Structures are given as structure tokens and as C-alpha cells.
Design an enzyme around this catalytic site. Sequence first.
Site, PDB file in Angstrom:
ATOM      1  N   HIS A  33      44.344  41.869  39.631  1.00  9.66           N
ATOM      2  CA  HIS A  33      43.164  42.618  39.225  1.00  9.66           C
ATOM      3  C   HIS A  33      43.438  43.951  38.534  1.00  9.66           C
ATOM      4  O   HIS A  33      42.536  44.549  37.960  1.00  9.66           O
ATOM      5  CB  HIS A  33      42.235  42.810  40.432  1.00  9.66           C
ATOM      6  CG  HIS A  33      40.891  43.369  40.091  1.00  9.66           C
ATOM      7  ND1 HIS A  33      40.141  42.911  39.030  1.00  9.66           N
ATOM      8  CD2 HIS A  33      40.156  44.341  40.676  1.00  9.66           C
ATOM      9  CE1 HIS A  33      39.002  43.575  38.976  1.00  9.66           C
ATOM     10  NE2 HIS A  33      38.988  44.453  39.959  1.00  9.66           N
ATOM     11  N   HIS A  80      44.636  35.685  31.935  1.00  4.35           N
ATOM     12  CA  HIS A  80      43.858  36.173  30.828  1.00  4.35           C
ATOM     13  C   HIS A  80      44.167  35.500  29.517  1.00  4.35           C
ATOM     14  O   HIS A  80      44.523  36.153  28.550  1.00  4.35           O
ATOM     15  CB  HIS A  80      43.986  37.681  30.747  1.00  4.35           C
ATOM     16  CG  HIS A  80      43.066  38.387  31.681  1.00  4.35           C
ATOM     17  ND1 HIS A  80      41.701  38.162  31.676  1.00  4.35           N
ATOM     18  CD2 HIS A  80      43.297  39.276  32.674  1.00  4.35           C
ATOM     19  CE1 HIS A  80      41.135  38.905  32.617  1.00  4.35           C
ATOM     20  NE2 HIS A  80      42.083  39.588  33.234  1.00  4.35           N
ATOM     21  N   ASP A  94      47.027  38.012  37.202  1.00 14.12           N
ATOM     22  CA  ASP A  94      46.159  37.777  36.058  1.00 14.12           C
ATOM     23  C   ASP A  94      46.853  36.986  34.967  1.00 14.12           C
ATOM     24  O   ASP A  94      48.036  37.172  34.712  1.00 14.12           O
ATOM     25  CB  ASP A  94      45.667  39.105  35.490  1.00 14.12           C
ATOM     26  CG  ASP A  94      44.599  39.750  36.348  1.00 14.12           C
ATOM     27  OD1 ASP A  94      44.665  39.594  37.586  1.00 14.12           O
ATOM     28  OD2 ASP A  94      43.695  40.410  35.782  1.00 14.12           O
ATOM     29  N   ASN A 105      37.676  37.998  38.725  1.00 17.69           N
ATOM     30  CA  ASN A 105      36.360  38.526  38.404  1.00 17.69           C
ATOM     31  C   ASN A 105      35.866  37.913  37.115  1.00 17.69           C
ATOM     32  O   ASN A 105      34.667  37.857  36.862  1.00 17.69           O
ATOM     33  CB  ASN A 105      36.334  40.062  38.340  1.00 17.69           C
ATOM     34  CG  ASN A 105      37.459  40.639  37.488  1.00 17.69           C
ATOM     35  OD1 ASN A 105      38.572  40.115  37.485  1.00 17.69           O
ATOM     36  ND2 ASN A 105      37.174  41.722  36.769  1.00 17.69           N
ATOM     37  N   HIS A 106      36.789  37.425  36.303  1.00 20.26           N
ATOM     38  CA  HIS A 106      36.378  36.900  35.015  1.00 20.26           C
ATOM     39  C   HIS A 106      35.841  35.474  35.118  1.00 20.26           C
ATOM     40  O   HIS A 106      35.187  34.997  34.206  1.00 20.26           O
ATOM     41  CB  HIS A 106      37.494  37.047  33.975  1.00 20.26           C
ATOM     42  CG  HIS A 106      37.746  38.465  33.567  1.00 20.26           C
ATOM     43  ND1 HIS A 106      37.568  38.921  32.277  1.00 20.26           N
ATOM     44  CD2 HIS A 106      38.137  39.548  34.286  1.00 20.26           C
ATOM     45  CE1 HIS A 106      37.853  40.204  32.214  1.00 20.26           C
ATOM     46  NE2 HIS A 106      38.202  40.617  33.421  1.00 20.26           N
ATOM     47  N   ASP A 120      39.436  35.006  29.320  1.00 21.20           N
ATOM     48  CA  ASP A 120      39.075  36.264  28.655  1.00 21.20           C
ATOM     49  C   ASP A 120      40.293  37.057  28.198  1.00 21.20           C
ATOM     50  O   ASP A 120      41.401  36.787  28.640  1.00 21.20           O
ATOM     51  CB  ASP A 120      38.070  37.098  29.487  1.00 21.20           C
ATOM     52  CG  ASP A 120      36.654  36.509  29.469  1.00 21.20           C
ATOM     53  OD1 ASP A 120      36.392  35.697  28.566  1.00 21.20           O
ATOM     54  OD2 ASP A 120      35.808  36.852  30.338  1.00 21.20           O
ATOM     55  N   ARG A 121      40.074  37.991  27.273  1.00 20.86           N
ATOM     56  CA  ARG A 121      41.121  38.831  26.671  1.00 20.86           C
ATOM     57  C   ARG A 121      42.226  38.085  25.917  1.00 20.86           C
ATOM     58  O   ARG A 121      42.764  38.595  24.947  1.00 20.86           O
ATOM     59  CB  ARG A 121      41.731  39.824  27.671  1.00 20.86           C
ATOM     60  CG  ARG A 121      40.806  40.224  28.816  1.00 20.86           C
ATOM     61  CD  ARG A 121      39.589  41.017  28.380  1.00 20.86           C
ATOM     62  NE  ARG A 121      39.839  42.436  28.518  1.00 20.86           N
ATOM     63  CZ  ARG A 121      39.824  43.284  27.507  1.00 20.86           C
ATOM     64  NH1 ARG A 121      39.537  42.848  26.287  1.00 20.86           N
ATOM     65  NH2 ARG A 121      40.086  44.563  27.726  1.00 20.86           N
ATOM     66  N   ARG A 168      35.208  50.361  37.956  1.00 19.67           N
ATOM     67  CA  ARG A 168      34.692  49.029  37.670  1.00 19.67           C
ATOM     68  C   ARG A 168      33.185  49.076  37.425  1.00 19.67           C
ATOM     69  O   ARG A 168      32.618  48.153  36.845  1.00 19.67           O
ATOM     70  CB  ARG A 168      35.047  48.036  38.785  1.00 19.67           C
ATOM     71  CG  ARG A 168      36.533  47.833  38.993  1.00 19.67           C
ATOM     72  CD  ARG A 168      37.278  47.294  37.770  1.00 19.67           C
ATOM     73  NE  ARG A 168      38.682  47.005  38.091  1.00 19.67           N
ATOM     74  CZ  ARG A 168      39.476  46.143  37.454  1.00 19.67           C
ATOM     75  NH1 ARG A 168      39.035  45.438  36.433  1.00 19.67           N
ATOM     76  NH2 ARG A 168      40.719  45.967  37.868  1.00 19.67           N
ATOM     77  N   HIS A 174      41.805  38.175  44.673  1.00 22.95           N
ATOM     78  CA  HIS A 174      41.887  38.762  43.334  1.00 22.95           C
ATOM     79  C   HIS A 174      41.817  40.291  43.378  1.00 22.95           C
ATOM     80  O   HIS A 174      42.768  40.982  42.980  1.00 22.95           O
ATOM     81  CB  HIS A 174      40.804  38.200  42.404  1.00 22.95           C
ATOM     82  CG  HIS A 174      40.863  38.762  41.023  1.00 22.95           C
ATOM     83  ND1 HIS A 174      41.952  38.577  40.194  1.00 22.95           N
ATOM     84  CD2 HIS A 174      39.997  39.536  40.335  1.00 22.95           C
ATOM     85  CE1 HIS A 174      41.741  39.211  39.051  1.00 22.95           C
ATOM     86  NE2 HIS A 174      40.562  39.797  39.114  1.00 22.95           N
ATOM     87  N   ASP A 205      41.572  35.060  37.393  1.00 21.44           N
ATOM     88  CA  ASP A 205      41.559  35.678  36.064  1.00 21.44           C
ATOM     89  C   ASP A 205      42.383  34.926  35.043  1.00 21.44           C
ATOM     90  O   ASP A 205      43.369  35.426  34.504  1.00 21.44           O
ATOM     91  CB  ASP A 205      41.898  37.154  36.110  1.00 21.44           C
ATOM     92  CG  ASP A 205      40.665  38.008  36.204  1.00 21.44           C
ATOM     93  OD1 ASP A 205      39.602  37.492  36.634  1.00 21.44           O
ATOM     94  OD2 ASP A 205      40.761  39.196  35.833  1.00 21.44           O
TER      95      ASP A 205
HETATM   96 FE   LIG Z   1      41.862  41.940  35.030  1.00 23.81          FE
HETATM   97 ZN   LIG Z   2      40.624  41.244  37.206  1.00 21.02          ZN
END
Ligand SMILES: [Fe+3]
Ligand SMILES: [Zn+2]
Lengths: 165, 377
Positions: free
Chosen positions: B268, B79, B77, B137-138, B108-109, B241, B186, B105
Amino acid sequence: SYPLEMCSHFDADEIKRLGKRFKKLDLDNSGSLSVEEFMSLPELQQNPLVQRVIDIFDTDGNGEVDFKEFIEGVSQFSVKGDKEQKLRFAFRIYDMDKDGYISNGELFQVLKMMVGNNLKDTQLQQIVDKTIINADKDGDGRISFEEFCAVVGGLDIHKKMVVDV
Amino acid sequence: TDRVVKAVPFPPSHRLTAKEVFDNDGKPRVDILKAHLMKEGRLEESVALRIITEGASILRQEKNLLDIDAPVTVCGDIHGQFFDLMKLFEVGGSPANTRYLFLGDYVDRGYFSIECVLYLWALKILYPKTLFLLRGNHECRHLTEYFTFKQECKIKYSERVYDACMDAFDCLPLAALMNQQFLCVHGGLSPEINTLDDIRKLDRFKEPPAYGPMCDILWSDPLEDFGNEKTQEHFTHNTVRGCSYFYSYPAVCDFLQHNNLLSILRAHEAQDAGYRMYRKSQTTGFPSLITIFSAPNYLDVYNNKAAVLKYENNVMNIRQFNCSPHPYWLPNFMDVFTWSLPFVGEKVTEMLVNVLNICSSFEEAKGLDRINERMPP
Ligand SMILES: [Fe+3]
Ligand SMILES: [Zn+2]
Ligand SMILES: [Ca+2]
Ligand SMILES: [Ca+2]
Ligand SMILES: [Ca+2]
Ligand SMILES: [Ca+2]
């Protein structure tokens, strides 16, 4: 004992009422409020914006606040006042030299008054920088009032700046 | 001149142009690009668009399941942690002479997701056959809508760019087959996936559905008690999740044998040591599953390490690393005005009313973020 000129939203009554409140605050009865006299208020000392307001109110910039400046200063918050008037006031919180633009160092210092130690100076400096970059539509490096309003008009915080007199 | 903390670097007000970003052969100018970005510089919108789209057209031509040769450095990840991403290439090596695989990923974040994407797409274009990106997933509309990426895009660039990114994400491959030994993905496994051909058979070109195999690959986690599970049950529903499954040691082991693979590499899941190695397969004596995680001190509060995997000369070496300092942003990319103003309104009002009444830790942080691991509504 001459009469006194001013511009404001108040009528004879509201002005008379404000005058009683002014006299009460003028301890030395000098006819113009000092910062010491303001800060005599218990609630007031807990407030980082106080001297800004005072500095904004002090139109002549003598360091006190005569009754004319007192009235015109309050008049800003009158329910009868309009959006721009209230916003223009806000602007002047940040515009410390009153030159009509908000400079970088200015925006920093004023914010610093409000956040204090909840931020490292470098952090504050950065958001301060990026804010200007994104709002300085004219490229001068400071902020006009026009550009100021561009950011905040939609926020209607001016509706929150009202007092009943 | 007026500035207070003059020590602090002022961000380029300049926006990089096509000629500064692509040379005459069309190759990206990454050294120029990396530097601008690190100074928090922006590109012209059109140049940004070019990068995202030129990268997407490459991805569009890649298979669902890439075939990747060792030596390779594999990553978890990201992010939006662009400044750690910089440190990462330092640790994993130069893309010029290193083969990379990213397990998704990217956004995000982190408040630098758009920079990561930009730099990454830039590198993909330059190194089409040695740098590889997969889907986390993002990488979808649903989550970016819900988190900061959509917002980040509008502030710094436009929504028109966010959209270009959404289309580029649909092109991201789903899995790699590394050195013919590792399935890299992922999230993890799916009840609806028995063989690798099962992966090849999917239409990846869409926003990930709420159910099914494409969802499971991006979203699956292993059991919390993986390897020591009380039943020989394979998949159970992922109650953390909100969708997809937990997969069990038997599940992974069945799939590994059935497909003649050595292990599964995945991201993930945030890890304190930047990685987690799971129970050795009884047959191979090699961990059946490995989690890899490349966001150190994730969210600025986990104070976790990040890691990458470097496979070479038959050795799977895990390089770890710590966080690198980065610029501050007000949450949801607020400006100082929108942030401070209402406080002002209150505070002066407060004042005047007064005047007129003169006359009558890893596991800690892990626990606090469970809703955000889970699916948006
Ligand atoms: Fe994540
Ligand atoms: Zn993830
Ligand atoms: Ca006085
Ligand atoms: Ca005065
Ligand atoms: Ca000024
Ligand atoms: Ca300006």
C-alpha cells in the site's frame, strides 16, 4: 495566355486576391512556387509539416506548385468546404505515396517528423504498431480512408481547419 | 515490409482460443498464456471472460481471512506492471513449486493491468490452494473508473469484461493469517477491529464503503513518524489518503499482543528499497510491521527497487529486484492519430494563415504523487 481550369470554392474575387498573394511569393516569377520560395517565410521554417503540405499541394508531383494547385490546395480549408474534404486532406498528410492507404512505415516517418527526439524510435514504433492493429478493421496491415475516419470523425478537428480568404 | 524499426517485435494479431488456453482437464495453459501476453497478444473475449469468472467462483468460496502455511513468498503492489510481474515469479520461484500470497493492488497506474489480472486469475485456477490473492484499494469500481483500468479494459477488450472484473474483485479475500504469526493485509488496521474474528464477521462481497472496517483494511497507513510518535494515541485520520487512518506503534502493538501475533505485513505504500521494516516490538524483538512493495521503478520515475518476502525455515528473507523493459503506451491508451491529429490541424492552419498574410528521484516522485495516493471524489 490561355485561360486556366480549376475546381474550388472561391469566386472571382477570392481567386483574384489569392492571385496577388501568389505573385508576391513567386520571387523568380517563374509561375510556380518552389520549396525554397516557401521556406523564405520566417514563420514557416519552424514547422515540420510544411513539406507535407507542399507535397500534398503539388498535385502533378513536379516539385513546385503552380497557381491551379495553389488554389485547389487552399480550397480545402475554405469555410465552404465540408467535413470529408478536410478529413481527406488530413489523411493525405499521412499517406505519403498517395496510394490511398496509410502504411506502417509511412505512419512512422510522418510522426517522427513531428515528435523528433521526444521519443525513442522503438517507443514510437510500438504505438505506431498498436494503432494500426486496432484500426485496421480489414486486416490488410495498412489504413484505408474509411478506417481512418472511423477513428477520428468524432473529434471535429475539421472545424479547426478553416481559413478566411 | 514497409516497417521501419523491423528489430522491434510485432504483436500477435491472433486472439487465443479456448482450446489454446485450457487443456482437456480444464487446466489453464500458462506457458502458452504467459508467452502470448508478453508478446502483447489478446485472447478471444469469451476466453478472457471464462478466466475471470472461473477464478471468481474460486475466490467466492474462500474465507475473508485466509489461513496460510509457510513456506511462502509474499508480495506487494503490482499496479499493472506485467513485465515486472514476470521478473517477480522468476525471483520468488515457480508457482508450480512455490506458495504465493499477493497483498492486492494488481491494476491501475500500469498499462498492463488487464494482463496481470488475466495471468493471475489463470494461475489461481491452476493452483487454487497454493496461490493466494487478496484485495488492494484499487480493486474496486471507484478507483478503476478514476484511473486507467476501466479505460484499458474497453480498448483491449470490452466494458463487458471490465464489469466481469468488478464482480471478480468483490470476491477477493481481505486478509491472510500467515503461519499463525502474521496478519497480512493491503493497507492496515481499523479502530473497529479488535480481534481476528472481527475480520471473519464482515460481508466482503461489495464495492468497498467510504467508511468502516472494510475500508480501513484496504486504506490504512502507519504514522509518518511511526514508532517515534509523540503520543500514545492509536488512530488519527488519514490526511494523506483522504479517508481511513494512520495507525501508531502502540496501536499495532496492542493489537499484536491482544491477538498473539508476531507482526503485520502490508503493502500500500511505495518504498525505495522495495520494502520497509518498522520498529521492533519490545517483547519479540521482531519488527512490528512490514511494508512490502513489488513495483520496481514505479510509474517509470521513482527508480525504486521492488521486493518480495520469502518466509522459510524460520527466516524472513527479502529478495529485491529492478525493473524490466516494457512496451510504450500513449497515455490513456491513445492511438497515434487522436494524439497527433489536432497538432496537424493547428500546424497546417498555422502555415496557411502565415502564407495568406504575405499581403495585407524517489522522494521527488513521492512528493509529486500525493493527490493520486488520496481518494478520487
Ligand atoms: Fe498503491
Ligand atoms: Zn495501495
Ligand atoms: Ca518559383
Ligand atoms: Ca507542381
Ligand atoms: Ca501509402
Ligand atoms: Ca486496412
